[model samples]
Target chain A: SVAIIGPGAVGTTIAYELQQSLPHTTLIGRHAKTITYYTVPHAPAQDIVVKGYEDVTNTFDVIIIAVKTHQLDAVIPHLTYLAHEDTLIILAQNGYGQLEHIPFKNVCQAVVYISGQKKGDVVTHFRDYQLRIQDNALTRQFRDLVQDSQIDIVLEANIQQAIWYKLLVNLGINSITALGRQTVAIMHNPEIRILCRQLLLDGCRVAQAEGLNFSEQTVDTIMTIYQGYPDEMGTSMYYDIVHQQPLEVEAIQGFIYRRAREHNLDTPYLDTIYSFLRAYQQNEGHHH
Target chain B: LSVAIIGPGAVGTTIAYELQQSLPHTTLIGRHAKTITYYTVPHAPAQDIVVKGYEDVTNTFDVIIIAVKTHQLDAVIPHLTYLAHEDTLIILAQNGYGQLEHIPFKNVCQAVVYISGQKKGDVVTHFRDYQLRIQDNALTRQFRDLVQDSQIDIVLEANIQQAIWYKLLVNLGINSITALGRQTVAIMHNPEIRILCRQLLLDGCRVAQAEGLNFSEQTVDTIMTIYQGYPDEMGTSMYYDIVHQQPLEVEAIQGFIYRRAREHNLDTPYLDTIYSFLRAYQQNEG
Candidate 1:
């Protein structure tokens, strides 16, 4: 049996998608309740109900850690029960190397490109599901479990580079867009676009200091990708800010900036944006 | 003539009413079609006087007097097609410098207004003293003759720009402090607000210098004296507007400095902070 922990937007999507192809898949969320799975058109149209963790007799073969990075402390406690010597856990989060503290027999990383939002019980999916994982034996097996599902999984040889590349994109697009209260699509104004490019260059400098090689054309490529999104479409950080929820800024832009400071690197644009967001967050807390 | 009073507010209405009263032969034009009314106060009961409409105005007037609040000037410009005649003399009775160049006029006469009045109900409650000074020139001779008598003080100065600049310095001292602290010019006498007023006026004078006006040290002293001259209860028009929730003349005052400082690559931290604070205050209301 495979278990999914933290049924948030990404967690629930991965769980619901996996249950369609894998019969013994068990979705474990924070709440103590029954999980109801609905079948796709190819499968027999039936409802499968799974009770609480007491009914489960077998350990999970693969565990997917899909909760937010901030909730890792609470989630870390429950993970010891599901993990075994043969169990392979996959991390489906935005940041890099967050699961280093967890002692697992086999750990795999997946760069999730899917965008989703959770409103109470309902999670709304905004884009297609595309997860990039490293090419390996356990990863191939994890791929086989959901190969027939709606998700399009790709096995990249250099998944580290893919995650770093996506990090660079987030550094360039997300922070400025959130601070300006604008969408990626409207950030194409010449002054704003140039400012965004400069911020990415600063982030790229920090990545290079940590021994990562990013292309010189990285900023342009990020800007082009950002322009492809809808004008009014907002980032996840913006969604968090608008909903008065705590953001994973420390894991994203703040993390890169802190690392840059350690290496004695100057990231003025990033520093400015970070300081502004930090002040705004503090001000918002006081007022709220 | 198509004349637009950028502010169309209390001061703007009073000036329009005074202009119509002084120049009976001249046509009066308004941007909007609505019947404009004025509240004459300190009389028996505040009575509303209906000002002339655009239809009542002739094709062109001898002069176009702009009495708008500084912030509303930009919005008022687009509606002022009737007064842009070649023979028309545009007289600016508004506060602040660097705005005479912004208006579309063949001949521009800058005037310093020393009128102390308030619009309550529908009538303006004028103080005992009302003084106007124009630059010493032949063009302003007719304007000088119009307000020579009838309980209004009129003077002609050789250096009209200096007069306007001096009046602006007085407004800079009074208006901003009164508006921001929700107090009056009398607040300038208070220890805390007095220090703030001094700082704000110093910043405003620095900004005025960047706009090509050389403000004298006496200007600052003049402001301090005026602050001391007023009763503790004396409030400027700015205080009244803020109390009424009306839009401030921010663009004409600090907003003008904010824009100009950006142009010159100079930092006006005081003005910038006040502008942002005002924005936050308004947003908090929402």
Candidate 2:
């Protein structure tokens, strides 16, 4: 049996896929209400009513925790009471360093590539249905269960590198998009392109400082990747800012800044972005 | 000589209110005719004043103070040309630089204005001191001779670029924080936000040096202390613009510094990021 926590975009999508293969999969949410999935791509509309956390009666074989980085702490106590010693706990979050504080011994961090948003009871899934986790027996067993599902689970030998890779990509794109209140189209501006490249380079340096020496073309590689994205498409952080939700700055830019300070690396661009985002979130949406 | 003050905003209205008390033929031109209630004066009680539009003006003036925002200068130019004679002294009291060269007038002067206030509907709240630092030239001397008896202090400085540079740095520090955070001067009360503001000013200091204006070692500290003096409830021009969902003056302060810093191959991540955000934010407003 598998229990999916957080009926947000990621959790709802995962439950939708997992339920096709595992019929007994329980979808847990804050409230025992029906959630509508509005996938932008070629998916039909579906209604799913999730079970509240208190409705769970049995321990699960696998637990997928998908929530905002700031809201992760509160979910841990619930996980502690539910998970047994043999239960596999998967943390699907952005940025690194979240694994350090988790008390679970059988925990594995998953770099989630799914992008969506939960506004009220509707979860909008944009694109991508992949989860990159560490290559281990525990994850392999978990992957076997979801292999027949629509979601793709790619196990990597160096999941840490993949995690850093995703973080660096987010640092380059999310900060610019969120702060500018713009979509991917803003990257078409030459000056913004230069700023993004500089941001990626700074993140690359910090990655190197953390012992992950990315290639010299890492900045250009990320730029090339961004070029292929549709102009109207917005990142996860961009939608969060547009909806006036709390940003994931702590895990993305804030993580790099803290690591840079510990490693004594000068990342002025990251520092400036981190400070502005901190101030933005501190005031909560717009300060009246 | 008669005088006209264009764009009855916070700066324009304040100057118009002071000049109307001393000058006989002072005209406050705007888009429409309305009465504004002046509030929070230090020595005087709140009072109402009338503002006239440009269509109502029938006479040209000897001096015109164009006190509009930098972005709004183009619209006021046509009206200004018809309201001025060939020898009219045009004093631009807008923030930032790189704008004076685009003006098509010979008798033009730059006024580094220091008056602080905000306008909400018909009410204008005076927040701070009234002063203007103009270039020590014959063109500006006429402006000085006109307002010499008024309460506003007119500093005729020979090196006006230094004054402009200092003001730009101050705005670069305070405006960027307030506008991006969408908060008032109170955001500076936070230690982390203040430290970030200090970093931005420190970067501005270096950018100024590359542009041939050498600032003192304590420039950042001085500017931070000046920010400390502002009332926490007070919001800057950019902050108010953001609050009202209007276009920002980002290109004036942050864009100015970013362009100059890039010219000398200097690294100013702080200014560059702020500039990028403000530019994109303006796009959303459009």
Candidate 3:
């Protein structure tokens, strides 16, 4: 049996894609309700029903925890009752430092490249239906099961580096998008580009301190990559700010800040950005 | 000299009230012609002054004081440039920078306005201070001569750049938080917002220091205490603009520091973040 926990954009997309090959794939969420799923732009949305955590009675052979990084704690306790000692645990999350909480030895992390967002009861899949994970016996087995599925699983030799690189990507665009309340189109502004580069540079410094071998041209590479995004495309954090939802700032920018402090590096840009995001998260803006 | 004070807002009307007593033909030009009730003291006797619209004034003036906001200056500039003769002292009494370069007029004097007042309906209350500091030049001296013995004190500073930078520093902290929080000066009482304001001022002070101005971190603290002295009910100019659903002077205030910090190879994350939000705010609403 296979179970995908958290029926958010990522989990719902994974569950729907996995259901094509693995029919026994169960989606666990807050409430057992049907969600409108837009697989691609302008495509017909599928209504998929999800099973709540309280209703999960069957232990799974593989369980993918696809909730947000900050929501890991609440879902971690339920992992004990749902999975046996040998059950493979796949964590699909953004940024780093979420793995320290899971005590299961059979756990593996997935560097999710899936671009999708959940708006109310509707989940829209934007682009990139893929996830990169470490090449191991258990992961390869899981990859083989989803080989014919819509989700493309890239088995990487160094998954930690990939996760860190993805964290840098989040650091580059997410903070700017959320704090500015702008979309990818704002990158056309030279100053916004400069700020984005500075943020990426700071993220790289912290990554280097963590003993990751990133190329010197990583920031340049990321800037070029940012230019490729659609003008009106909003990142996950951008939507959160616009919708007045809580941000994943701690998992993204706050990660860099804490690591910078650990490495004795000065990241004023990160400090300012982090503080403002924290202030916004803690207090109600304008209304309060 | 025949003077015309455009923008019947707080600063313009105050200058008009002062100049009308001394100079002949002191015309207060605005969008609409109306009588402005000016209050010098708290609930004092009002000075019922007549204001004229721009279309009514066809004659060229020797001096034109453009006291409009930085954003509103562009609309009136073309008309005023035609209304001005050669060597017409065009005193720009507005906050922030970058607007001075756009004006094609020659004798344009950029005044660092220190006046404090607010316009409510047809009434303007001059809370305190009627000072306009300009660069010590022949054009600015003409402005001082025009308002010779009025309540408006024109301090022709040798280094008006330094003076303007000082005022810009003072405006950086309070204006940003008040505008974002959508609160009055009372928002500074919140300890978290106070720290945010202090950091912004410190960031701005550092940029000012790099710009060759003598300002320390203590300057940030002094600015904080000055904000604390204000009435809790009073709103900043930025706060007022946001409340009125008007565009903020973000480009002038936070944008100035962000640009300078970049030129000086300094990292002002706080100011840059605030600038991003303000610009994003403009992109969405303004």
Candidate 4:
């Protein structure tokens, strides 16, 4: 049996796919009365809700961590009691340096390529579910369960590189879009696109300073892929800003830029965005 | 001969109330009709007055006062094409600089209005002595005779750009700091931002000096003294705009100096930081 904790957009969507491919699974939500999957690309809506996480017994083989990064600290202690020695934990989160703090032997971080959002009761997904999981025996078993259920899973030996690849793209795009109250269409404006590129290149330089091998064409390369999305759609960071919610800044720009400083890197664009965002969130009272 | 006042906000209406009492030909122009009030002094008393728009008037006036938001100045130009001409005296009454070049009238003057007021629901509140500083010219002499017996103290300046630049420097520090922090002028007294204010003004002074003017260099010390005495509840127009979430006047104030700094090859890191924040904030307002 498998217990999916914090059935947010990533967790609930995966639970739906796993239920179809395998047979038995339980979806747990924090303080949720009823959790429901509203829509996805090809799957219909369903209610795979349970009352809470504390009620579930210790019978699960895997614990899929799917909460915002800032909220990760609080959930770790409980996951320790829930997982056995052989229990494998898969981290489904934005790529960050904090993966070092997850405290487990066989933890594999998955890089999510699907774009999705969760309102109060409903979670909606677009595009397809694509996963790049760190190669392991349990990850391969998890992949086989969802392989036939309209999802593509890739197992990578050096998953850290894949993580940084996505992180660089997100750092280049999401911060600009969110701060400007803009859609992806801001990419269509040359001046704004240049600003976005400078920000992305700074992130790329920070990664390269840390001995990561990204090419000179890395900024342009990510932009083309970002342009593939709907022109009006925004990243989750954008929604978090407009909807008045706290962001995962600590795990995103804040983490990378702060680390860049230790590497003696100059990140003016990143530093500007990070400071303004922290101050804005402070004044906006996004935490409450 | 007639006189006209456009954009009857706190500043315009305060000037209008004084001008209307002394000069019978004075008429206030706005987008709509309203009963506005102006306090004799801060927290003293108020009287309600009705104002009208310029839609009915087809005749061009002798003097036209263009008092609108700095960003909204261009929109006012087309409407003035018929109301103003080569011989008319156009007075640009706005806090920020860069309006003198845009108005094409031959006899154009800028008014450095040293009065503070607020407008709430058509009430214009005046809190201090009203003074109008103008360049020493024939147009100012005519303006002096027009309001000869009125209370608006007229000071003729030989170099009006000096006064304009002084006010511009003062506003550069005050507005950007207050708007982003959502604080009043008291934020200027804070130790860290006080340094910010001086740096911004010092950069502005550098540009003024390169253009062959000193702006007295005492502007920072004196403005800080004046700022400490202002009402603690006072917020600038830019501060109010940010609180209400409006587009800022980046080009009208900071943009002018950034251009000057680049032209003179002055290393203005302080101003560069302020301008970048204000400019980036303009887009972030979306």
Candidate 5:
């Protein structure tokens, strides 16, 4: 049997696209009223009345983890319980660094490029899912299982670069957006535009220290990528702060800060951003 | 001799309260009509007080202490003609630096105040030692003679500008940090903040040297020693201004020093960082 943990937008999209082809797949997480899953435009909605996994007389053969990165730490113990020795666990998360020693040997991490969100009981996806997975055998078989579905998959040898690159993109967008309390259009402000680039370059330096060397033009590329986003675009961290939700601080800039400190590099720019955000998280920013 | 203090802030009100105790007749000039309440020893009956507004005053005072903030001085200068005569001892008590031409040419005294106090609602909290380093001159002594017996004490400085510059250096150290950090002087108890305070002050000291003035390492050490003696909860006036979301006196303090540094090509990294942060706070909201 296959189990999908944390039935959020990405989680549901994975389940929705593959459930028919893959079969024997169950969704995990608590839901209220009805759990509605629908694709963009006019796709048939699946109103799946849910059942949990406590009745696990048998461990799942493949446990596709799709929990909020913030809720990941608490769910680790449960993920372990659901996995048998032969289990192929797929760890899908945002911002790198949480794939330590999972007891299962066939663990694969993916960089999810799916625009997804859960509003009330409805889980929505703007695109048919695209996931960049690390090249592996269990993942290869899993890819074959969903070959006919709309879910597009790319397998890379060094998934770390993709993971950190996605996070760098967030670093370019999230802090500036959150700090200014504005949308992505803040990138047009000349001064803030420079700051956004500086933040990207700063994160790039730390990435270099971690043996992932991107060139000086990394900021330029990130800016070009940012220019493609709509004026109304906002990062998850930005929206989290707006709604008083705790930021995904651990997986984002704080993660960069942690890695940068290991090399004893001075990240005054990155340091201030993380410290300021952490301060904001600590009781609406009275970091005295 | 009658005196009028033309600023109703904590500094102005403290000057008014002390001068009131010394001189038989003293008036505090405020733009809007308001009550002044001050405490001498924390629990004393708040000094029952009222300030004279611009509309109510006649040109009847012998001495005028324009006790407003530095940024407010420009606007307040045009109004001083009504408060002074040829021989009136005009005193400008403020943070940062100013010009003698802002007031009348005769008996102009620049007072660099080292007293600490804050105003909240109608209550003003004051810690004593309301020391004023007045410019030394025959006219200054004549003005000093009028307030010899009050809680206010006057010390003479050969060049009042240097004294104001010294206080400006201290403000550059403490004010910007506390305001930006949203912390108190006790934040200096933290190793990082203490280093930050010293760095800002060191930058101020360097900027002072580039100009004719000097703020020695000894002066910097003395400031640190005094800060060590203050309670951890002690915050600068700028900190209170920032916490209250009022515009800062950056132009008069850090902005002045940063501009000076640019002339000498001095690297004021900390000042530039602070200047940019406080500049955004020029129209501060929360």
Candidate 6:
């Protein structure tokens, strides 16, 4: 049995995909008082009315950790009865260093490139979920479970390098776009474009310092990826901040900042952004 | 007498009422169609004064005193089409620079007003001293005579632009910083607030350069001097707006620096930082 933890947008989508293809999978999630799933083009209608997790008792072959980084501490206590020596844990959250504190057998990291939003009872998946996993037995089993599923799962030889590359892409678009309250297409103005390029270069330096081999044209590649999106497309972090919802800021950009400070490198641009965001967060907390 | 006051706000009302008292025959045209009443100095508490508007006077007044805020000037001009002619001597008594190019009036005279007054429920309260400076020219000479010995004190200044520029420099520091932080000029005595004020003033000086004026190194010194005389509990218009939860004229002061920096390719670090912070404040608070 495969159990999916934290039934948010990512968790629900993964569980819905796994349930359709692999009938033997068990989706273990936080028991909400009410659960309703809305239908979409790619994913079917899934109405979950489970009031409690009392039915979830048996050990699983695989456990997918798909909660936010900040929610991990709260989620760990609930998963105490699920893990065994033969269980494999896969982390499908944004950012790096997910398995740093948690000890699990056959730990795997997946670089996620999907976008979705959770509204009330519905999780709307706007794009196909792309998973880059390492060439390992757990990854192979995970791939087989969703081989014919709508989600695109790719097995990469070096999943760590792929994660770093995804981090570089996020650092360029997420923080700057979020702070400016603009989209990548609207950011084509000459002055704003230059500032965006400088921000990417700053993040690239931090990524390189973290011992990742990156090409010199990394900035151009990041810009190209941003430009590939629709003009009105906004980052999920931007949407989260606008709605006053909790963000993955600490995971994506803030994680790089933590690593940069650990390496004793000066990240003035990133530090400035961090300070501004912290001040904003403090102001929000004071008022709300 | 071709004269038009763009803004019928408190300052505009004060100036219009003062002009009516000095030159009884001067034409008064405003944007609002309603007849405005101008209470003269020593205006009786029980009595009401009614000032009529010129509906058909197409002839330009000899001098026009623009008493509106800097941002509202653009909207004020088309209304003055009936009054603006080839030789209309337009005098601007508003804050900030770059107005000479924006105002529709050709022959323009800029003035700096150092008057203290307040408006309470359609009635304007004028302080003791009312000083007005105009450019040294023939039209200004006529303007000075019209109000020389009148209730309003008028002075013809040789370097009126310098005086106006100095006033803009002072406002660029005091008005915005005080409003954004919700503090008074007395807060400048605090070391941290004083440092922030100085930095903002320095940024304003760079913007002044783009407008073709160089402020003195003692700009902060001048601010300190003015702050000493300012009423301890006094609040600027900006402060009043923020207090009443009204929108501010931030785009006129700090936004000018942001725009100028973009034009000149100059790095106004202090101004940009403060402007962004103020924008956030306005968004979150106002």
Itemize residue pairs with steric clashes in candidate 6. B2-B60, B2-B61
Q: Which candidate number maximizes DockQ?
A: 2
lDDT value, residue B136 of candidate 1? 70
Candidate 1 regions off by >4 Å? Answer: A32-59, A103-105, A134-137, A155-158, A182-184, A187-191, B1-5, B8-75, B84-103, B107-286
Rank order (by TM-score, best first): 2, 3, 4, 5, 6, 1
Which pairs of residues collide in model 3? none
lDDT of 2 by residue, B1-286 (tens): 8889998888888888888888857888898888988865644588877888888888999889888888888778888767999999888888987466677887887788899887778888877778989889887776778787777778999889899899999899889898887778877756668877887888899999987887865888888788878888888889889879998777777888888898899977777777877887777787
The predicted structure with the larger lDDT, 4 or 6, is: 4
TM-score of chain B of each: 0.77, 0.93, 0.94, 0.91, 0.91, 0.81
* Model 3 misplaced regions, further than 4 Å: A285-288, B14-26, B34-50, B102-106, B117-129, B136-153, B173-212, B217-221, B224-246, B254-286
Candidate 3's residue-wise lDDT over A127-186, tens digit each? 887888899999999988889899899999988888889988888788878766678887
User: In CAPRI terms, where does candidate 1 land?
Assistant: incorrect
A-chain TM-score per prediction? Answer: 0.85, 0.94, 0.94, 0.91, 0.87, 0.86
The CA root-mean-square deviation of candidate 5, after full C-alpha superposition on the true structure, stands at: 5.4
Better of 1 and 2 by lDDT: 2
Clashes of each: 10, 0, 0, 0, 0, 2
Q: How far is A51's C-alpha from truth in model 3 (Å)? A: 2.0
Per-residue CA lDDT of candidate 4, range B192-286, in tens?
46665666678788888988886655867887676777776689888898777787777778878888888999977557655754666676575
lDDT of 4 at B210: 88
In candidate 6 chain A, where is summed lDDT lowest over 10 consecutive residues?
A275-284
Predicted complex 4: CAPRI docking category: incorrect
> Scoring each candidate complex against the real one, what DockQ results?
0.07, 0.60, 0.38, 0.20, 0.12, 0.13
TM-score of 6: 0.69
Q: Which candidate tops lDDT?
A: 2
Residue clash pairs of candidate 2 = none
Local accuracy of candidate 1 as per-residue lDDT tens digits, A1-288: 688776666766677777778756776765555433222213432333433444444678888777776666676656677677778888877777655777776887778876666655555555657888888998888788778887778999888788887777777767755654445544645545666677788888988887887656877787787777766667777677657666667777778878888999866567655654554454455557
Each candidate structure's TM-score, on Cα atoms with residue i matched to residue i, is: 0.58, 0.94, 0.85, 0.81, 0.76, 0.69
Instruction: Report the C-alpha lDDT of model 2 over A1-288, residue by residue, as the tens digit.
Output: 798898888999898878888878888866688998876754787888799877766788889888878888878777766788789888888888556587767788888888776777888787788999999998999999888988899999989998999998899889988877778898877778878887788898899988897866987777887887788778878888888889889888988888888999887777777877887787774553
